[PDB]
Design a protein around this ligand. Sequence first.
Ligand SMILES: [Cl-]
Ligand SMILES: [Cl-]
Ligand SMILES: [Mg+2]
Ligand SMILES: [Mg+2]
Ligand SMILES: [Mg+2]
Ligand SMILES: [Mg+2]
Ligand SMILES: [Mg+2]
Ligand SMILES: [Mg+2]
Ligand SMILES: [Mg+2]
Ligand SMILES: [Mg+2]
Ligand SMILES: [Mg+2]
Ligand SMILES: [Mg+2]
Ligand SMILES: [Mg+2]
Ligand SMILES: [Mg+2]
Ligand code: NA
Ligand code: NA
Ligand code: NA
Ligand code: NA
Ligand code: NA
Ligand code: NA
Ligand code: NA
Ligand code: NA
Ligand code: NA
Ligand code: NA
Ligand code: NA
Ligand code: NA
Ligand SMILES: [Sr+2]
Ligand SMILES: [Sr+2]
Ligand SMILES: [Sr+2]
Ligand SMILES: [Sr+2]
Ligand SMILES: [Sr+2]
Ligand SMILES: [Sr+2]
Ligand SMILES: [Sr+2]
Ligand SMILES: [Sr+2]
Ligand SMILES: [Sr+2]
Ligand SMILES: [Sr+2]
Ligand SMILES: [Sr+2]
Ligand SMILES: [Sr+2]
Ligand SMILES: [Sr+2]
Ligand SMILES: [Sr+2]
Ligand SMILES: [Sr+2]
Ligand SMILES: [Sr+2]
Ligand SMILES: [Sr+2]
Ligand SMILES: [Sr+2]
Ligand SMILES: [Sr+2]
Ligand SMILES: [Sr+2]
Ligand SMILES: [Sr+2]
Ligand SMILES: [Sr+2]
Ligand SMILES: [Sr+2]
Ligand SMILES: [Sr+2]
Ligand SMILES: [Sr+2]
Lengths: 46, 82, 143, 81, 56
Amino acid sequence: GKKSKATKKRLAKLDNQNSRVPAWVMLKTDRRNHKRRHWRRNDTDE
Amino acid sequence: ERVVTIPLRDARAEPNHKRADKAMILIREHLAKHFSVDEDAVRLDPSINEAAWARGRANTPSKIRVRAARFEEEGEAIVEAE
Amino acid sequence: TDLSAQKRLAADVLDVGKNRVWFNPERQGDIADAITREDVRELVDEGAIQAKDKKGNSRGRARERQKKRAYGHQKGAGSRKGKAGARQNSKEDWESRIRAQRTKLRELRDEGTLSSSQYRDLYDKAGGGEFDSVADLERYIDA
Amino acid sequence: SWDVIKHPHVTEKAMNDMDFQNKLQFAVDDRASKGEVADAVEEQYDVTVEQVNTQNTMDGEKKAVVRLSEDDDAQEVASRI
Amino acid sequence: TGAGTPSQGKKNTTTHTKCRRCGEKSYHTKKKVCSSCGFGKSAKRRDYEWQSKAGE
RNA sequence: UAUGCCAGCUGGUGGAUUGCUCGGCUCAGGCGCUGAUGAAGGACGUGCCAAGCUGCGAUAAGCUGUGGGGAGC
RNA sequence: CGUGGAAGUCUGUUAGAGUUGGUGUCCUACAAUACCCUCUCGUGAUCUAUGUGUAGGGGUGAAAGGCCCAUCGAGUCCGGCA
RNA sequence: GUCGGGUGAGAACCCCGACGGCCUAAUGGAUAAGGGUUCCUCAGCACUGCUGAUCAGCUGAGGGUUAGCCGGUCCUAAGUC
RNA sequence: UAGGGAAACGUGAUUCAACCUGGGGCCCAUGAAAAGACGAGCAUGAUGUCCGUACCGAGAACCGACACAGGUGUCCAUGGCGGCGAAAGCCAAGGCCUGUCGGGAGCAACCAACGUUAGGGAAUUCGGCAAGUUAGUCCCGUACCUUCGGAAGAAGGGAUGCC
RNA sequence: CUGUCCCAACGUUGGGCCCGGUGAACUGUACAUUCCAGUGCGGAGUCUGGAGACACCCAGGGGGAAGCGAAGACCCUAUGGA
Ligand SMILES: [Cl-]
Ligand SMILES: [Cl-]
Ligand SMILES: [Mg+2]
Ligand SMILES: [Mg+2]
Ligand SMILES: [Mg+2]
Ligand SMILES: [Mg+2]
Ligand SMILES: [Mg+2]
Ligand SMILES: [Mg+2]
Ligand SMILES: [Mg+2]
Ligand SMILES: [Mg+2]
Ligand SMILES: [Mg+2]
Ligand SMILES: [Mg+2]
Ligand SMILES: [Mg+2]
Ligand SMILES: [Mg+2]
Ligand code: NA
Ligand code: NA
Ligand code: NA
Ligand code: NA
Ligand code: NA
Ligand code: NA
Ligand code: NA
Ligand code: NA
Ligand code: NA
Ligand code: NA
Ligand code: NA
Ligand code: NA
Ligand SMILES: [Sr+2]
Ligand SMILES: [Sr+2]
Ligand SMILES: [Sr+2]
Ligand SMILES: [Sr+2]
Ligand SMILES: [Sr+2]
Ligand SMILES: [Sr+2]
Ligand SMILES: [Sr+2]
Ligand SMILES: [Sr+2]
Ligand SMILES: [Sr+2]
Ligand SMILES: [Sr+2]
Ligand SMILES: [Sr+2]
Ligand SMILES: [Sr+2]
Ligand SMILES: [Sr+2]
Ligand SMILES: [Sr+2]
Ligand SMILES: [Sr+2]
Ligand SMILES: [Sr+2]
Ligand SMILES: [Sr+2]
Ligand SMILES: [Sr+2]
Ligand SMILES: [Sr+2]
Ligand SMILES: [Sr+2]
Ligand SMILES: [Sr+2]
Ligand SMILES: [Sr+2]
Ligand SMILES: [Sr+2]
Ligand SMILES: [Sr+2]
Ligand SMILES: [Sr+2]
């Protein structure tokens, strides 16, 4: 499949949203990424 | 150290297409009994492996001449074909 | 030590398949430190990384058989598997036969042996399939 | 309004292009053309750009590979900034 | 051929995509119409009274 | 007496119960239009380190003025 | 006699399409229609990818009430509705 | 698959060699759709993996896709708006 | 006196996919369109932006809730022996040991797939279901019936290796 | 023509059995070592009378639990539906 520029920006964003909650937020809140999406297990849009 | 003749006729009990694998077990079992050591301690030089797998996995020779040496503190045996 | 990454690089460096590249068992640690392609090329020069020779099927037993068949042997009724017209195409055999017969008659006209009246009579008979071979054509011309 | 050059792209592959091919890599704005990237580099750094190669990265940004002339040295330009 | 599992293998067509107007994955790229907001069909947004209970 | 039955004791498992309420539900009073000066909504951005929410819009958790406020942020 | 090479033509696990029997295997499956062997068609009313059209008392149907996204003697969703 | 060896706290299944096999319209090569980072490197084993794992399509962090002449882009098709 | 190769760094031939160019035949079937190019020269210089580009493409990267024995289009149809063959079987190039749990018991009963069974030979069974028999090629030879096409590979008989 | 049969045998490969590791589901009112008779809503492990019965575990083929699976499609009924 051939992706467009906008489709690429969205996929790019979804990949960034897939990073873990930083180590410092755990210490600041004194103690979970609920939007964890896998390439196989989960499904994106379009 | 001595030269022994290992009979591999008990490899017929195991299915035909897997005779070579059982032949290798039988060699390790024989040398451990006759040299009074553990099966983990017996080391078979690749020459024995190639001798038993010569005609494939199914046609293993009924006998095999083998030269084995015995030494060390815990006790072990290095073995090869001749 | 995991040398599978290097096996991929060596196979591209030597331009040989992954299954044909050999690594020295005594030099595993030196190959484990081989990060780049320049590191691999250096180990190829050192002889540590080598490419095995590719197999080629021996045509010797086929050649002996080709000699026998060219001499007319081993083509008996017990060796034929295909039908007759499958072994030799009839349309192609007629093309071979009639072209040869028309080339003979063309030469005999230029030679002066046959006149444009005798030639026409034979060409039309050849196109009607009156002659089996070129020898059978000559056997008709000579009386 | 949007600026053309966002920040320099400094990675291992970016340094190889700088040391051997005299190329400076930049993370630019995705609406910028090859010509607009060329002009902005010649103005912000005082160099002469020969060729620009753009790629839309899987980061949502546009990566531009900018080749300088022989008069300019990429290693010297990246060291001052 | 079964209408079940073996007919699922042919399903590689893209129809419903992210909509320019509402953002839902309902823009039918073959019909050029959105099944959620009505983009491509109407200037007005697709809303219906049956999307909620009669007295609500 | 093994396998084992019934009740209990100590410890688990589980999360009922009791207590608690940053949420709801309902009633009442007030108030009440926005948009081509491009709304509402959505997308993507925006933080030193930033995934979610909130905010904000390339001037991007914010800029200016007046008033309040006050030693903190 | 040769030439020619016709054909909803024949043999064919060529690719490909189909699915007769085993009422085999499976039947908390590998699988909400699968596995194996056997069997049928295979230059044509052939097979096939992609694009495109026809919509629910309506389509589509070489007709079996077949098919219209595991849903059909009237699809699915939500509403009427407690 | 087997015998040796490598790394490792730990090795039947991670890596090397040898021997022994399997695939030939595919189990090889290039691709469409579709997927969407699954690609590469490093570090890992709590999750995932029909057992184990030092391995991995898994976890985390970095990195990676460069075109006048390959596609899109342009043209018109059934047809659609 | 590019590139590539450790080296040599060939020459002729046959059969010839691709590609080129012709002749014939068929249709109650007649086998796109448009942009564009040609027509219509040469120098020199400049410009040539924008979007895609990773990887999988499958018995683990797609659809089927799964690392699913299912499903899923295209090009490689000219690798060798074999043979009519893009058939079988075997083997290169390439790929793989991941159709991913192992160890042990001459390893019983029982089951799935399967081999061989004397004499008899369908007695089995609703029924030869299952299995088996036959088989490729050449030669000889071939009935009833027929819409004269066919029946037909009728049937039946012989042959078949190697040197 | 032949293991379809007379009439069954031996063998082969994968299971099956033992060990390490992984690890479900169906089902469950209770009690429950049953058997022969009887009785009972006339088809009882549980009632009555007798008989038998030391507990536990392994493998088996499935006699019984009118076994498990599905609020019977048959039939009738409903001022039911299509
Ligand atoms: Cl492309
Ligand atoms: Cl011609
Ligand atoms: Mg990432
Ligand atoms: Mg002919
Ligand atoms: Mg580009
Ligand atoms: Mg279609
Ligand atoms: Mg009917
Ligand atoms: Mg690693
Ligand atoms: Mg798998
Ligand atoms: Mg007999
Ligand atoms: Mg039969
Ligand atoms: Mg009922
Ligand atoms: Mg009825
Ligand atoms: Mg009615
Ligand atoms: Na997905
Ligand atoms: Na950045
Ligand atoms: Na017990
Ligand atoms: Na108000
Ligand atoms: Na954040
Ligand atoms: Na004729
Ligand atoms: Na079938
Ligand atoms: Na309807
Ligand atoms: Na494994
Ligand atoms: Na050949
Ligand atoms: Na039998
Ligand atoms: Na029973
Ligand atoms: Sr999936
Ligand atoms: Sr990145
Ligand atoms: Sr399809
Ligand atoms: Sr419309
Ligand atoms: Sr409305
Ligand atoms: Sr049947
Ligand atoms: Sr099975
Ligand atoms: Sr079934
Ligand atoms: Sr069968
Ligand atoms: Sr046929
Ligand atoms: Sr035909
Ligand atoms: Sr309702
Ligand atoms: Sr490929
Ligand atoms: Sr561990
Ligand atoms: Sr990988
Ligand atoms: Sr590629
Ligand atoms: Sr497949
Ligand atoms: Sr199938
Ligand atoms: Sr090979
Ligand atoms: Sr595994
Ligand atoms: Sr025999
Ligand atoms: Sr009979
Ligand atoms: Sr005969
Ligand atoms: Sr009693
Ligand atoms: Sr049983």
